[PDB]
Symmetry: C7
Subunit: 262 residues, 7 copies
């Protein structure tokens, strides 16, 4: 009998569907325009994508509110349900968002770059790449370590490769009866005859400690980062050979034994 009400309900459903379609199209267009505008301003691609996604989902939320109000759902109900859904999605994506922001910061400020040897909170290796959510490094023995970006930015970043010049330290323990001046001059000759040691830097050769069984000399010399390990090995071998040749003894653990027979 009352055919007007059924027609009104049908036209309301059709209007809601039309609103949904038009709103989705408008959201896509506006989000794409905003993304292109942000990219043209040299803003980072990840940040632009995040902001454009926010814009698109906001416009879609407006469209959903309008359509559901058309089919009789109140604005407060739609807002509450969308808020609950967004809270659930945000709880699911909180860690991913933290890692995403951290990766953006890592790429932007470059505390380390690919190819550099770093120590990221107890693990050390050569950086391979900083991905969207985590950074991959390869250790000296060939292991692959994947570290989330947020964990990296939250802690200390120790970069071994950033400075072109680094320092070697030698701790040489010789017998107490060794001549101090002879040890000093032999070590000084060894480090002066080495061309890869920078002569304009610190060249410390000092007696450092009176140990339990030996007197320890400290040698601190600087070299280019690509020569540090080779310099250490060569200087150590030369120290061994020249101390053996000069009679300077590397002492075994000492022990004064007071003999008492009962």
């Amino acid at each position: 009998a009352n055919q007007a009400l059924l027609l009104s309900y049908a036209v309301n459903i059709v209007a809601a569907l039309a609103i949904i379609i038009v709103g989705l199209i408008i959201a896509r267009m506006i989000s794409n325009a905003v993304n292109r505008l942000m990219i043209s301003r040299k803003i980072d691609a990840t940040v632009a994508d995040f902001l454009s996604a926010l814009v698109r989902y906001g416009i879609i939320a407006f469209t959903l509110i309008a359509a559901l109000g058309r089919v009789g759902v109140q604005t407060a109900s739609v807002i509450a349900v969308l808020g609950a859904a967004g809270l659930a999605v945000g709880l699911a994506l909180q860690g991913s968002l933290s890692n995403l922001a951290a990766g953006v910061l890592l790429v932007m400020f470059r505390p380390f770059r690919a190819g550099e040897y770093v120590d990221l909170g107890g693990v050390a290796g050569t950086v391979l790449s900083v991905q969207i959510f985590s950074t991959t490094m390869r250790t000296a023995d060939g292991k692959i370590i994947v570290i989330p970006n947020g964990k990296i930015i939250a802690g200390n970043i120790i970069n071994f490769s950033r400075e072109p010049v680094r320092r070697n330290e030698f701790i040489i323990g010789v017998a107490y009866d060794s001549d101090i001046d002879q040890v000093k001059q032999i070590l000084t000759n060894i480090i002066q005859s080495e061309d890869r040691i920078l002569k304009d830097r610190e060249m410390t050769v000092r007696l450092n400690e009176l140990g339990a069984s030996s007197i320890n000399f400290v040698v601190r010399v600087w070299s280019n980062s690509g020569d540090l390990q080779n310099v250490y090995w060569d200087v150590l071998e030369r120290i061994k050979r020249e101390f053996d040749a000069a009679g300077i003894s590397f002492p075994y653990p000492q022990m004064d034994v007071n003999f008492k027979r009962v």
Copy 2:
């Protein structure tokens, strides 16, 4: 007397029940359509299920609000009660949601896969499977370790099997009076005569440390991941045999005893 009011109450209850039924049916249909649409777009099954569940429960919330408003419950009351119930359910399911998102991320980005040996925050073993809420690994001695996914993604992932080539390290301590060149050449011959050691990689044989009782040589060689342990064992046995044959002594702990009798 006033039979109109009772009939109105009955028809309101019937209308509420009809709204509940129709809303449940519509929620099921729309959730299934959205799930099929997301699956057809190659979106992950778990993500599609989560989003479809959100859509279905949102439509059910709309239906409940409508029906309870029909039976006289105000919209604000329904929103508050549904919010309290959803907050309780979310508190119950927070950890499960975190593990679910972490497992989705693990499957999507594949920091490790089944069959690879990994170290996940202090526990090492072969990955068996990444399940919905946790990952199962079997240790080298046969234990089964179950680790929640969120704990895995929150920490470092060390992958032992990702790189096809890995490095062995040998620390050999010989007596101080040993000839350095003889030790170097014997170790070099041992590592050159081994076919499983990659000759195009690093083949370091250097004197590394002047220890308390011995001078330590470091040997670093690379091999395919499937040959690393066998290479280590064979090279160690050959080092022992050839050092015994050549007279190079592995020294016991040394002690210089200064004898004093009172």
Copy 3:
């Protein structure tokens, strides 16, 4: 004089009491129906009880709002007071809810079951039962340890009994002058003559380490979980007896003493 107002107040109080009674009855009936429906769908009893309790308390909240509005208390006041009470109850029951959800997950996914020996975050023992809020285990020496379920699911679960086959490891230190081939062949004969050692598994007998006073051999063999400890004991005793018979010496801590008398 104005007897109408007092009668109106009395009838409002009576209406509020009737609303309270009817709402309690309806809440009980609907909660029971929902619980039976969820149980008939093979849903877990604990989850069904939790959801039915939520439904019942929501209906009771609706009834309280209606009755208090009848006696003149505003809807916002009732919502705020019920929210404060629910927040207090939720603060009291947060840990219990976490443990309840964790126990449901433990029973559903079964990382361990009753009778299995597990290590749950530093404590090891045989699982007795997973209760509603905590899991009880008995240690090897007879202690009873009660661990909350949330603590269990939040950490690593190491299961000793899940795999039917497990591995034994032997570290045997022999004197440096021992013949490597003789040690290898004696250990190989010992592990081949043992029937409980699985011959289709790994049977590693290798020289593993050049220690301070001894050379260490590693023996890794597999056995059924019920034979692991007995195999370890029998193999160790046989190793001792056969090394004593063959003259292979287990060395005491060594010390090279360089005697110097002043």
Copy 4:
């Protein structure tokens, strides 16, 4: 002149005071009735008191809202001020509420009871009582330790007294030249001649470890909880006496000294 307004203000103040008095009386009566109802249902006294306090304070909040609305204070203002006050009180009482819930759980599920020796997160002692907010234990040396209930339920509970039977473990180190069979048979005779050792339980006597200076035998026997320490002491003394009588030597730390005079 306008005496009507002053009379209206006075009557509003009087009405507010009457509302306050009546609401306090009604809150007390309803809270007491609810408390008696919950007690008659065998519900725990602490839970009943907590819920009755919530009911009473909710009714008092309703009364305050009504009275302050009578004297012209808006409902939103009263709700906001009461919410701020309740938030402050809840911040003050959060830890006490956590301890109260934990104590209720401890009394309800009884992981330990008064008189039992337990280890509660690193501290061990005999439980004296579980109070409303904390549990008191007395250590073996007479100290009194007070532990909050929430800390107890949040961690592992190790109960030493729950099982009627517990296990002793003996690690006996004998000289390498000792006869294995003689040691095994002497230990077996010692543990068989002890009546307090349960013969239907495990009676392990095995060689367990090849130590640096001794070979270690493990003896594991079970006894009633009240006899464990006495059994340990008696068995240890018998082991000492019988090993001395049989010539089995408990070895001092060994040292192979290779004498070299320069």
Copy 5:
């Protein structure tokens, strides 16, 4: 021209000032009355002060809302601004509130009192006083330690002075060739001849451990708390003197040296 509007604005300002004054006076009076009522009910002074401060500030908030509404500021604006200010003050005072509640609990339940020696989470000393926010203790060497109350109640409280009787433990290591019965009887005579040792308590004198160089005897005796240290010192001195007199040797670290000359 329009002098009515200016007069209305002036009278609104005057009305707001009058409301402010009257509300402050009423808040003071009601807060004082509530404080006196709570004190007369034997409620703790600190709790009464806290609750009275809450009441006074709530009444002041009502007065501010009324006055600012008089001068045209909307109720929602006043509520939001007061909420922001209260949130800032609460953030500033959160730790102080926690310490205040903890101090109230400490005074109420008295886990320790002034003059008792306690160990509060790793620091031990004699309690001087429990103040409003922290507790002061003096260590054995005279240091003053101030510990916040919340930190105290959140952790274990070890009370050394609560029990009137405490236990001493002696670990005496004697040579392996010592007669067990003679050692036991000498220690038993020493502890029986001491009057300050409670003879109705445990008087354990047992062989406890077969150490590396000595056999260890455990002596556990009880005494009044004021005699524990003196008993320990006297018993130790008597043990030394009587073991010296009886020939029982306290052994130096032992070493079996196997002499080998190459």
Copy 6:
């Protein structure tokens, strides 16, 4: 044509600017008056500044709401935007606010003062000043340590300088064959002949431990805080000299060597 609307818009903008100016002036005046009132009540300057800033910013918020409502911005929009801005500022200033409150508490209660030597959570030094956000101390070797105030109040405060009298402890290890009475009397004479040791305090000289190589005596004496280190040094030197004079031997690490030649 319609010049009335443009004039209305201009007059609304002018009214908004006038409201902004008048509100800023009123906020400044009222904040200054409140600050002077709080200062005149001897309230701490920092607390008065904080509260006056809150008052001023609240009045400015009221003014902004009024002006933006004048130019057509709704009250809810202004409240939401100001809330977002305040939340951002509060997130930025949370740690600073915590440190500010902690510094106020430190100055008010004075657990330490400038010039006193304290240990603040593992770092020890002389307090220089308590600033607004952090406290500066100078260590014994001249380092400057800056510690945030919140970290200081959250942890234990150990004050070395608060008590005028402190205790020294001496642990003297003598040979086992030393006469106990002679050692006791020599130490007693040393501590009695020292005038800076308080004779009305504890003067403990007891045998404390039977060590591995020596018997340890404990000496505990009290002195004024300014004499503690000098007393320790003088007493130690006197102990050395008098033990050397009396023949009491400070023993070297002992070792019983059981010689066995194979």
Copy 7:
């Protein structure tokens, strides 16, 4: 037919676009004016930028609300969507905001400055610069460490370079038979003959400890920060030379061996 409605919709869209443009322009102008005003008041540039960004985004939010209300979107919907977007952005930028505030505090209060050697929570090095989100330091061996500002301000800051004068400490262990007065006078002569040691500061030379094998003397002297290490090295070398010349012996680890042959 109804061309009025379409024209109205078009004019509403045009009005919304005009509102957007005008609001963006006004936001830029007002934000720039506020930024210039804050800069002219000597306020920090970073704080001014943060506050100006807040002002600009608030005005943009007002403009968006107005325009979307023009095109029919309700104010509550716009507020909710903008709140969700702002919450997401704040979650992304929380750590960056914390680091920004911490860097502002570091620059403002200057606990350390560029060129000073500091220890920031376990890592020590020379400060290079305090950037917007992190601080860069170079270690003594040339490594580069990047530390987030929030981590720096949350922990202790140890400044090695702030004080112009610092203290050296020498622990010299000599043989027990050494003359105490001779050692004291030799050390005193060494430290008096050193010109870089401040004679107006502490010059402690005392016997500090009776060690296991030696008696330890403590020497504490002060010097300018630029001379500390050189003074330490020179004084140590002089101590060695003069003790060798005077016959004072640096003792090897001592051992009293009680010889027993069985």
